[PDB]
Symmetry: C2
Subunit: 91 residues, 2 copies
């Protein structure tokens, strides 16, 4: 499994940027996607995919230990829709 | 909707890197995630989320052209699992 440092070293190798500049850009990528989604804005990235949000419906159930009802409210959640290039690469 | 150029301008603003260097890093980010995923490896990015692949199981389906029952092969698809920080930002 790759971590952020593994991704950073490969970003540096692919671009010619230093590992420290690559790290700044990689962190900023995640931060920018986070901010657009926090503002309720979709982020479409040609050749990769689309980051967006979706409404996860309310759920109701029971605590198996107490028998008490648990109501989980409807919530906005992040979502990613892979583009063609990314789907083709993994299939 | 934000596109890749909108994201690159914000990566430049956040890091102090030129838009040209931000563009190189943003494109390399997507390429590195794609390669890891093409190798069947997961990429965990702390404070953002995890890119991975998942197997969609072989099943019985219907041929839309003939109307007849068919056997649909298992397929590997990309997937993204948002971390806590990203979920908290959008809720």
């Amino acid at each position: 499994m790759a971590n952020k440092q593994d991704l950073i070293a490969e970003v540096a190798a692919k671009t010619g940027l230093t590992k420290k500049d690559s790290e700044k850009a990689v962190n900023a990528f995640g931060e920018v996607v986070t901010e657009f989604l926090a503002k309720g804005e979709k982020v479409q990235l040609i050749g990769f995919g689309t980051f967006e949000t979706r409404e996860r419906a309310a759920r109701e159930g029971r605590n198996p230990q107490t028998g008490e009802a648990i109501k989980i409210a409807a919530t906005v959640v992040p979502a990613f829709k892979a583009g063609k290039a990314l789907k083709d690469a993994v299939k």
